């Protein structure tokens, strides 16, 4: 059927510079289950990212939670990038630490 | 404890 993933990026706590935090990439509503998720810092792939290895919803669409540990500085920027068969191009959602 | 398949589609 191919459903398009919805992507949300957010931290565990309000960002304070110097305070360790967790950044989350929450990907929902997609099918087929094959998907590729990267988290990016300053335009470069973050190597140490963990997944929740995935599940599905009442309505059968798939969801997964990616996360990585990070400490906010004044100059770092973060994004989450998703490749999935329902999209011709990868999809990037930038984290906005001021929201 | 989880469920067990005993019939095929």
């Amino acid at each position: 059927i191919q459903k398009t993933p919805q992507i949300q990026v957010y931290s565990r706590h309000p960002p304070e510079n110097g305070k360790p935090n967790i950044l989350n990439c929450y990907v929902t509503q997609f099918h087929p289950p094959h998907i590729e998720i990267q988290m990016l810092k300053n335009g470069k792939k973050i190597p140490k990212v963990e997944m929740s290895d995935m599940s599905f919803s009442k309505d059968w669409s798939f969801y997964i939670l990616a996360h990585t540990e990070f400490t906010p500085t004044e100059t770092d920027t973060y994004a989450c990038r998703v490749k999935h068969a329902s999209m011709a191009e990868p999809k990037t959602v930038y984290w906005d630490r001021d929201m | 404890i989880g469920p067990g398949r005993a019939f095929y589609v």
Partner: protein
């Protein structure tokens, strides 16, 4: 109400070996166990602290069941190709969900045993736990197979029997983790928009369980008209978070109130910018 549910998936990948088979089990809505066929030494594994109490015969038993279930789903994927006359070169998915909702009086409320092929309903056990709802003609074949084989009665015996009883066990052994409450920590952010007005966003962080109410007020009257929202979303540590925002005039921020209602709070949280 409480629940014990098992979410199961098999995905084919012709040319890349046998299909990937995965099982996840939840109490209420918390993950405690998982099986993944692509793991190193694939076994049923604990995903929450309280289930680790179970002895080795528990994990050997569940690993046997999962490996038995993986074999059945291999056959079902091959069968599914015949029912729909699909080529054997594509990837296809089969999904399964089974479990029980029970009240405090220990009574079964609802039992589930339903399937989907390539993301669409295939067959589901009805609420009577005696009849099957078959989506297309292909699933009616299956319904006829399972009708003459007494499938509903065997499967119902798990739903009314083992499912209810282990949920009670899991609820006592995991009580301090499953029935805990964690209060929301709330704050409000302030962002001037290009048009001169101000987006106020009210955050609620680190609450458990997931249910919450997040509303904006203006001296007493709710503002569901210009209120943007995200759905409640999970953190890694098992807590949740949410936000709602309104657009307000600059300099009049302190006229707006954010209200948070949650189990972990004795009384609602009021806060303003």
């Amino acid at each position: 109400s409480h629940s014990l549910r098992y979410f199961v998936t098999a995905v084919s990948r012709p040319g890349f070996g046998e299909p990937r088979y995965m099982e996840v089990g939840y109490v209420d809505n918390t993950e405690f166990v998982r099986f993944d066929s692509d793991a190193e030494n694939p076994r049923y594994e604990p995903r929450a602290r309280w289930i680790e109490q179970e002895g080795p015969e528990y994990w050997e038993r569940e690993t046997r069941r999962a490996k038995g279930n993986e074999q059945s789903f291999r056959v079902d994927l091959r069968t599914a190709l015949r029912y729909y006359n699909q080529s054997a070169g594509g990837s296809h998915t089969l999904q399964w969900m089974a479990g029980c909702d029970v009240e405090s009086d220990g009574r079964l409320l609802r039992g589930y045993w339903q399937f989907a092929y390539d993301g669409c309903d295939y067959i589901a056990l009805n609420e009577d736990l005696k009849t099957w709802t078959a989506a297309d003609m292909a699933a009616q074949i299956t319904r006829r197979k399972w009708e003459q084989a007494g499938a509903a009665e065997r499967d119902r015996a798990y739903l009314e029997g083992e499912c209810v009883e282990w949920l009670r066990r899991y609820l006592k052994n995991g009580n301090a983790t499953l029935l805990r409450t964690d209060p929301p920590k709330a704050h409000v952010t302030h962002h001037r928009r290009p048009e001169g007005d101000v987006t106020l966003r009210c955050w609620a962080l680190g609450f458990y369980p997931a249910d919450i109410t997040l509303t904006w007020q203006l001296n007493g009257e709710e503002l569901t008209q210009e209120m943007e929202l995200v759905e409640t979303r999970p953190a890694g540590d098992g807590t949740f978070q949410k936000w709602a925002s309104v657009v307000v005039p600059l300099g009049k921020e302190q006229k707006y109130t954010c209200h948070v209602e949650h189990e972990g709070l004795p009384e609602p949280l009021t806060l303003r910018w």
